[PDB]
């Protein structure tokens, strides 16, 4: 018996720290990085009173997000027979407070990102996940209270906002979309335009992209009653070449992938590459997290040049691909974390363009057993060839002239539609 | 101080209120009988030159450790030094 529209793009396109009382009470779409949040709680929704002296049910009152007053004199009489809520006939709803800081990539230099409260009601609640890059269309207000008896000087109601809508970083299929979209699928040669739509601006190896096409497309686990589901995700590996587009491609997959996370090698890109979290009740509740792959589950892993990685984090490397569930010893809290991610790897060969004609075990310091978890090895080349760059440099120059493949929306929907 | 000395100003005299332990509840207004039953009660606050004081020191006292049982712990004992 209820619905509300999320609607659509409403610039704004304002960030965080830029907002004003001019923006208050009027809906403002806003951007920010998802942060820690409370668990979903029941909301008072519609108030009602079994009261005291005056009789039940008295009928429900509409409150509140969030005020609910004042019930002075009523329902019989007045008081002391005064209004009080009862569990019966009282509608409720899900509620979640959330923290979302402004995006560090959008963070002005040397200035600390600002914290922002994130309100959640109805369907919007719990749909968000912490650490996500996200957009929100809210309404900025002085809301609420104001006491805050601490301030006082200068007297203010601490600002809070609930976005009508939320969107992950930064699309879904529909009938009329998928239906003709199904008609695309019937062709067999579609496989090629999948290479054609693979990385059209990249050119590159049709072969290297083939392996790209493979793990990128995903697959069934598949479960074995009542035991292991084996591994439905591809662990992708790339033997690099200096000067080659290799580092660039996974980045294509980045905006390509519905769910994607790239921590690169180490030093270390986000984040710790593993779950370090210990609580700490106190303080205030602390926060718990897993490895980098925890951020995206069923989403493919993105990493490059493990050679620059520390061996400690590199243990989780072979670790993640193995059990397909994350685990660590710190500290008192005990669980079993299950994360399933396709895993991409591209690392540059030791030394020169090609390490040795001798077997890649000679090529790489990395152990075969840890490499063993890699089903696909992407090896590249080559020594200079005459026409080779004519086939590319001419391609490349024409690429930069800007200033066949499926539209990425279709192809990106294609896989997600498939994985779903 | 054992007893504050308030002074009524207007009615004057002298006020002495006992105080025990760590705290006290200070008197106000005027209790002076000249200001008693008269519409005007004199103002008063403590006169430190007037009121008597007592020097108060204190110390914890640890056990000699030979007296102690083989187990448990040394017992500190709060004491409060006063006067000469």
């Amino acid at each position: 018996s209820e619905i509300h529209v999320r609607i659509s793009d409403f610039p704004t396109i304002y960030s965080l720290r830029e907002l004003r009382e001019s923006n208050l009470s009027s809906l403002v779409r806003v951007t920010g990085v998802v942060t820690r949040r409370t668990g979903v709680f029941p909301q008072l929704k519609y108030v009602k009173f079994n009261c005291l002296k005056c009789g039940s049910i008295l009928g429900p009152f509409f409150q509140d997000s969030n005020e609910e007053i004042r019930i002075s004199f009523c329902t019989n009489c007045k008081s002391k027979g005064p209004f009080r809520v009862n569990g019966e006939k009282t509608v409720y709803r899900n509620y979640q407070r959330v923290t979302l800081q402004e995006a560090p990539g959008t963070v002005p230099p040397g200035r600390l990102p600002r914290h922002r409260e994130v309100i959640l009601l109805a369907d919007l609640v719990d749909v968000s996940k912490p650490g996500e890059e996200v957009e929100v269309t809210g309404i900025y207000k002085n809301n609420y209270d104001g006491n805050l008896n601490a301030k006082n000087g200068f007297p203010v109601f601490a600002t809070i906002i609930e976005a009508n809508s939320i969107k992950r970083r930064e699309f879904s299929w529909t009938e009329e979309e998928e239906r003709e979209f199904r008609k695309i699928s019937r062709d067999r040669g579609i496989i090629d335009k999948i290479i054609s739509s693979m990385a059209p601006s990249i050119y590159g190896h049709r072969d290297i992209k083939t392996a790209v096409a493979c793990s990128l497309f995903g697959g069934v686990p598949k479960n074995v009653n009542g035991k292991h589901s084996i591994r439905g995700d591809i662990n992708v590996l790339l033997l690099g070449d200096p000067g080659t587009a290799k580092s660039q491609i996974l980045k294509y997959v980045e905006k390509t992938a519905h769910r994607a996370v790239f921590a690169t090698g180490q030093g270390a890109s986000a984040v710790g590459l593993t779950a370090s979290v210990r609580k700490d009740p106190i303080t205030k509740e602390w926060t718990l997290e897993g490895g980098a792959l925890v951020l995206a589950d069923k989403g493919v892993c993105l990493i490059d040049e493990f050679d620059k990685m520390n061996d400690q984090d590199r243990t989780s490397i072979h670790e993640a691909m193995e059990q397909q569930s994350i685990s660590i010893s710190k500290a008192g809290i005990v669980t079993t974390l299950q994360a399933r991610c396709s895993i991409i790897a591209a690392a540059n060969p030791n030394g020169g363009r090609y390490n040795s004609t001798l077997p890649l075990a000679q090529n790489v310091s990395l152990t075969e057993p840890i490499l063993s978890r890699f089903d696909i090895l992407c090896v590249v080349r080559d020594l200079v060839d005459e026409e080779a760059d004519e086939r590319l440099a001419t391609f490349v120059v024409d690429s930069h002239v800007r200033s066949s493949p499926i539209p990425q929306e279709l192809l990106m929907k294609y896989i997600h539609y498939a994985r779903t | 101080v054992e007893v504050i000395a308030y002074t009524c100003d207007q009615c004057g005299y002298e006020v002495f209120q006992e105080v025990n332990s760590r705290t006290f509840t200070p008197l106000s207004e005027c209790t002076s009988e000249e200001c008693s039953q008269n519409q005007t009660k004199g103002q008063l606050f403590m006169s430190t030159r007037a009121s008597k004081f007592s020097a108060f020191q204190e110390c914890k006292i640890q056990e000699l450790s030979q007296q102690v049982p083989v187990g448990h712990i040394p017992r500190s004992l709060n004491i409060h030094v006063n006067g000469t």
């Binding site: 230099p109 040397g110 600390l112 | 101080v1 105080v19 332990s21 760590r22 705290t23 006290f24 509840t25 200070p26 103002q43 606050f45 403590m46 430190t48 030159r49 004081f53 007592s54 020097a55 108060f56």
Partner: protein, 438 residues
Amino acid sequence: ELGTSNLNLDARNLLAYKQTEDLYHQLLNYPQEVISIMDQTIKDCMVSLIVDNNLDYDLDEIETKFYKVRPYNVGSCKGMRELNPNDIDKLINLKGLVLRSTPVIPDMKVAFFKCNVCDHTMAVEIDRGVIQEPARCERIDCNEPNSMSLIHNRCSFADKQVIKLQETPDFVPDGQTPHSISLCVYDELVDSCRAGDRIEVTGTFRSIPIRANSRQRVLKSLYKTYVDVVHVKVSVRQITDQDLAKIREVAAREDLYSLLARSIAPSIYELEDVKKGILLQLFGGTNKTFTKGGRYRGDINILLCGDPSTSKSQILQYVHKITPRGVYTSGKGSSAVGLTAYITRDVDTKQLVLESGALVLSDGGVCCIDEFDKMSDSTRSVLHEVMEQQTISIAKAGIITTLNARSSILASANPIGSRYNPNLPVTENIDLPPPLLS
């Protein structure tokens, strides 16, 4: 002439002299009231002095200016810990260096008031330790019984600045603790006292109660105590014209380039060419800012090195006294973080507070360096920044600050030999990198 007022008195000139022999007592019995008559009498004693010269200082208004006594050297007070209860209010000679200086505290003088009507501005001074506001009323008079409006920005104020001070009277009873001292002060006494400085500051004793609950009217028993800070006594340069000529004379002297060097480190023996360098650096260089940029300064830093216990360290120990702004730090005890931007929590205000580093206070004047060879590799890098930019860039923590440090520096060097030994490579002997060394 100066119209400075605030006379510092003497104490004791009431002894031995007559009369005032009892006033010398009577002042020590009740110093507060004594200053009250005396600050006023000085006014009339000025006014009485001016009537003989008749028209003075344009004219009678300079007498309208307030005068006051700031008496010192009252007997000799014994440390702090000795202090008697009987001593409640009397002048006290004291010594100690300031542990902490609090931010200036505002105080009440004359409270400002208003009613609902008219609204009207009638107010009464804070006066005593209480503020008594009439229920009504000014304007319309009337009455009527309106709440009395108080705008605190209108009412009078003055500075009272709290300083906790740990005295070091020595003669410490043992096992007595290094007790400290509370102080409030007032006006010029406020803020005029730098923290960390041993001082003769004198004042009457003071103790006042405080509410236990800080809600309930109940006060906690015995009163907390603080200093009345009656008087202070801690311990651009403008040179008189004549010795300046002696500079022009001493400059005419032939050996000043040398004779000054013997006076540079008279305590020190030989190593004169070493003194000669010390002689140059203090006067080292001249600023060129050009049209823009430039600023190679005069800043010149020469590292001393050689045999251990050459008394090479006595120079810097000595030179440290020399420079108006000097710097001296041992190796490995000083860190690159100690050279700039501490940014520690104030911890009294419960908020992080940025602090200039060793190099920042190093900025200006000479700087001595112990164990520069022993210095951390994170160290010298902040210095290489100083070596080139003549500045320190702090982007760390919450804020970006690229701060200038322009200052002389000299490092003490201890050869790893420990003897430098005959022959050998030169630079390799000193250790440290050639880029650092050259």
